A paper describes a structure:
The bacterium utilizes a set of proteins, termed complement regulator-acquiring surface proteins (CRASPs), to aid evasion of the human complement system by recruiting and presenting complement regulator factor H on its surface in a manner that mimics host cells. Another member of the CRASP family, ErpC (also referred to as BbCRASP-4), is an 18 kDa protein that belongs to the OspE/F-related (Erp) paralogous family of proteins and has also been demonstrated to bind factor H. Moreover, ErpC has been implicated in the scavenging of complement factor H-related proteins CFHR-1, CFHR-2 and CFHR-5, although the functional implications of this ability to bind multiple complement proteins has yet to be fully understood. ErpC is a member of the CRASP family of proteins which aid in complement evasion by B. burgdorferi by binding and presenting complement factor H on the bacterial cell surface under distinct circumstances.
The atomic resolution structure of ErpC has been solved, showing the formation of a β-­barrel, an architecture which is completely different to the pre­dominantly α-helical CspA, which is the only other member of the CRASP family for which the structure has been elucidated. Several of the loops between β-strands could not be built in one or both copies of ErpC in the unit cell owing to a lack of electron density, suggesting that these regions are conformationally labile. However, ErpC lacks the additional structural elements that are involved in these assemblies, suggesting that it does not multimerize in a similar manner, and analysis of the interfaces between the ErpC molecules in the crystal using PISA suggested that there were no biologically relevant assemblies. The observed molecular mass of 17 000 Da correlated with the expected molecular mass of ErpC (18 316 Da), confirming that the protein is monomeric under these conditions and, in conjunction with the PISA analysis, that it is likely to be monomeric on the spirochete surface. The solvent-accessible surface of ErpC exhibits large regions of negative charge, which suggests that ErpC may be acting in a similar capacity by binding factor H via interaction interfaces reserved for host-cell localization. The binding site of complement regulators on ErpC is likely to involve residues within the loops between the β-strands in a similar manner to other bacterial factor H-binding proteins. Mapping the sequence conservation between ErpC, its paralogue OspE and members of the OspE/F-related protein family, including ErpP and ErpA, across different B. burgdorferi strains reveals that variation occurs mainly within these loops. These findings suggest that ErpC, ErpP, ErpA and OspE share a common architecture and are individually tailored to binding specific complement proteins with different affinities.
Numbering used by the authors: 38 to 52, 56 to 80, 87 to 179
């Protein structure tokens, strides 16, 4: 039984690690929807969504490291997937230390006009651990 409803965590990206914005995580009837808020208002859109059957994988991946399948992935402005989405994309997470602090890190999609150069995201592990229940 999932207890969470909606929460917000700060999200970082690669330039060096830099602050990007807020990631809103919502528990829907079927699965989870994540939204990205960048700047002030500013940019506000779906980041990725996943089905009910992938909720347990998502919770384990976002608190321990692992993988989960999204039903739809958009990412941010610099990704190829932003305009039209990518279906069934697998997200692989790792726990990495950034300035003596543990983060959940994952790769996004390819950058718009770059030779398989991919975006990387980071979220504070403690922020996810305390919210995902």
């Amino acid at each position: 039984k999932i207890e969470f409803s909606e929460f917000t965590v700060k999200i970082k990206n690669k330039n060096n690690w830099a602050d990007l914005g807020d990631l809103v995580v919502r528990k829907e009837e079927d699965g989870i929807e994540t939204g990205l808020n960048v700047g002030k208002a500013g940019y506000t859109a779906t980041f990725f969504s996943l089905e009910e059957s992938e909720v347990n994988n998502f919770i384990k991946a976002m608190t321990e490291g692992g993988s989960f399948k999204t039903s739809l992935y958009y990412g941010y402005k610099d990704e190829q997937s932003n305009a039209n989405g990518i279906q069934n994309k697998e997200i692989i997470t790792k726990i990495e230390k950034i300035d003596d602090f543990e983060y959940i890190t994952f790769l996004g999609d390819k950058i718009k006009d770059s030779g398989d150069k991919v975006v990387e995201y980071a979220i504070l592990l403690e922020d996810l651990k305390k919210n995902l229940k």
